[PDB]
Design a protein around this ligand. Structure first.
Ligand SMILES: *[C@@H]1O[C@H](CO)[C@@H](O)[C@H](O)[C@H]1NC(C)=O
Ligand SMILES: *[C@@H]1O[C@H](CO)[C@@H](O)[C@H](O)[C@H]1NC(C)=O
Ligand SMILES: *[C@@H]1O[C@H](CO)[C@@H](O)[C@H](O)[C@H]1NC(C)=O
Ligand SMILES: *[C@@H]1O[C@H](CO)[C@@H](O)[C@H](O)[C@H]1NC(C)=O
Ligand SMILES: [Ca+2]
Ligand SMILES: [Ca+2]
Ligand SMILES: [Ca+2]
Ligand SMILES: [Ca+2]
Lengths: 219, 219, 219, 219
């Protein structure tokens, strides 16, 4: 009756992609999420999706903490929820990407987590944990491992300036990034540098992807 | 022991109209509500009631989010509670109205919801979901489908100005409305335009109703 | 394992007065309270106690809402907790008083409640519900029935001024009071008017009591 | 399935030191903590650790209330959590210390608690309860019994000034202290007076320890 994530939902007999209620160990009130029941067997809990630029992603700290957008469309689940999910078990991360030319690619990471051992994940900046890459999109996230999450109004990166403001996004910026999936929906090639929905290892630093979806599943 | 709404309360053997405790899926602490155990079989959870103008409804955003008034009289349950209720299952909406001339009418909607797929229903403005009308009061709500909730201190309507301020209420304003049940208790016909407890399809834009009650029941 | 109040604690086999954990229906996290297991059979949950003036009771709204002092001594449980307790069942109120001359008296009320039907008890001012007096101290509370709770920084009384500020306390002031148990610990007779720990029906308006304890038990 | 502390975790079959989920009686959502499963039989819940000066401990009131640092390294669990743990049962405290010269020592207290009978532990300043010393480090905490917790931005000590600011730490200061484990990581002997990680009874007032760990276990 109380699935902890989309894998529990799947194993309980629910095979259709869609919105379901999940109840993380330390977030007993629970919340709704979009479940991908098809990718590599299914059971993936989505936490980010870009697909048409209908939602503004250049948001501040509170928004990235609490989440925004809609589960059936573009959205960000919220770092407080992502933390609740990834700390209750060992999760893997799957990232699906799509360009404006019919092309698709993906990146899988054997281990993924946010603020895994932080006493206060929010004050600690929801530090990223990620490793073990494999896929077709190439790795554009391993360099971000260990970095705190930075937004336009809360700098915690390794740059002299605010990477989030400079690259119009919100991410576990270093100095500054190799991936920027929460960047501006610029739609394809653009002159501005690395400030769109980027995944450098696949499409470079001046090409804003058409679609992106970040999801997790217990290892 | 833990009814999720008034229908569960009814099915458990409670047949008297009154105040009962309910526990929505994602609001485990629960809260009290007024249950209508008579209308069309009973089991309706009330979330709004106007009946004598004793309570001020020209309130701000926090009040409409958290609720105000008293369960045994005029009140607004609060968008956070209405959201908790309508997202846990598919609900229908029933609206009972009464004028100052002994007359009554009602409007039933096969589907009703608030912020159904919003990651953060409050930030998303508790968007309205409603469809499938039937009744005697006529439909004065379908045009509001998809609109966010707007209050005098938080504009999210499709008007150049603030509909909530202009029509002294709080509603899922468009530009501006066909219904305004949270408007001023003006008592019958009035010169001011559409700023009373209106249900245009039944009594027009210049007649403030004597009674209104909005309630929901699982489809 | 989860007593809802001190009566449940008593009925479970706990006969010693003391501090115990209770879990109100709509406050599942629970909290600790002092239980009186001797008065008229025992099972009373204490919510207020004055006994030596060691604690300041001239506090603001947040303090009276959340509570202050210590369970083993002078304290105020907090209106949010008192509300959680009195709305889960029908409770009676018992008030024990003591003067500085060895004398004692008590007042019992067959029904007692705070914000019983308020959608938002805090915004509604935790309105008092009380009736059916009997005892030796005389009735000094029935006149306060229906009044909202007023503090020095939140006026909701029927006076032109702030009763709480004027009589240095916090109570369900009318205009202004017949009882003021949260008043200043003035110790016996005093020149200032009605601004001490008063229970007018027993000791008048210019005598601050030595001891007072307010507690509840399911009817 | 719901251990209340690390002793429950141990008794359930978990013998490895590490991070585990615990669920205090009045903090049902639960949280993670580091468990010491080796010291004197194991089952100790850690709430403070200093080991390399990588974390800033000169923090304000909110930080000491909510916690900071990481469970696998230097951290402070947070007074709200320590309170939730120590009020659910009778706990003993164990303090392990280490200097920069290979030396180690410890202090054990038969009884330990924070804000044990406070209606609102935070407003009451999380008062310290501690007694019954035994060990090799000597007692440097008994004098602090009964004192409230003081930080650089919230003075509640018995000093004319702010002990926390003066001795660059956060503690249950009196006037001012005999122990200062949350002080500056000064690394050994230092000229400044008593403003490092001190445990006076063992190493004096001008020697900042290399390691310290504070943990609790049910008596
Ligand atoms: C191209 O896009 C279409 C539309 O989604 C999709 O069905 C197809 O699999 C994609 N790839 C190719 C090679 O057509
Ligand atoms: C008129 O109002 C009365 C009073 O509530 C009610 O009993 C009655 O059913 C209403 N309708 C008619 C036709 O009397
Ligand atoms: C007077 O006070 C004492 C002390 O608490 C108490 O034992 C006694 O019952 C009181 N009443 C009388 C008549 O002594
Ligand atoms: C000295 O430090 C080492 C390193 O941690 C430790 O193994 C040893 O037990 C300590 N004491 C002595 C006497 O070596
Ligand atoms: Ca920076
Ligand atoms: Ca507008
Ligand atoms: Ca007044
Ligand atoms: Ca001081």
């Amino acid at each position: 009756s109380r699935p902890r994530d989309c894998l529990d939902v799947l194993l309980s007999g629910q095979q259709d992609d869609g919105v379901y209620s999940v109840f993380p160990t330390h977030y007993p009130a629970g919340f709704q999420v979009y479940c991908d029941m098809r990718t590599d067997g299914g059971g993936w809990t989505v936490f980010q999706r870009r697909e048409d630029g209908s939602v503004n992603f250049f948001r501040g700290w509170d928004a990235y903490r609490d989440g925004f957008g809609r589960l059936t469309g573009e959205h960000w689940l919220g770092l407080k929820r992502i933390h609740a999910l990834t700390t209750q078990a060992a999760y893997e991360l799957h990232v699906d990407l799509e360009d404006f030319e019919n092309g698709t690619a993906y990146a899988r990471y054997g281990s993924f987590g946010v603020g895994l051992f932080s006493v206060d994940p929010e004050e600690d900046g929801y530090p990223l944990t990620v490793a073990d890459y494999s896929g077709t999109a190439g790795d554009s996230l391993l360099k971000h491992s260990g970095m705190r999450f930075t937004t336009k109004d809360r700098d915690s990166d390794h740059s002299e300036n605010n990477c989030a403001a400079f690259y119009r996004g919100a991410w576990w910026y270093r100095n500054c990034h190799t991936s920027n999936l929460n960047g501006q929906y610029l739609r394809g090639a653009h002159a501005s540098y690395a400030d769109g929905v980027e995944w450098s290892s696949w499409t470079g630093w001046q090409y804003s992807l058409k679609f992106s979806e970040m999801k997790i599943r217990p290892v």
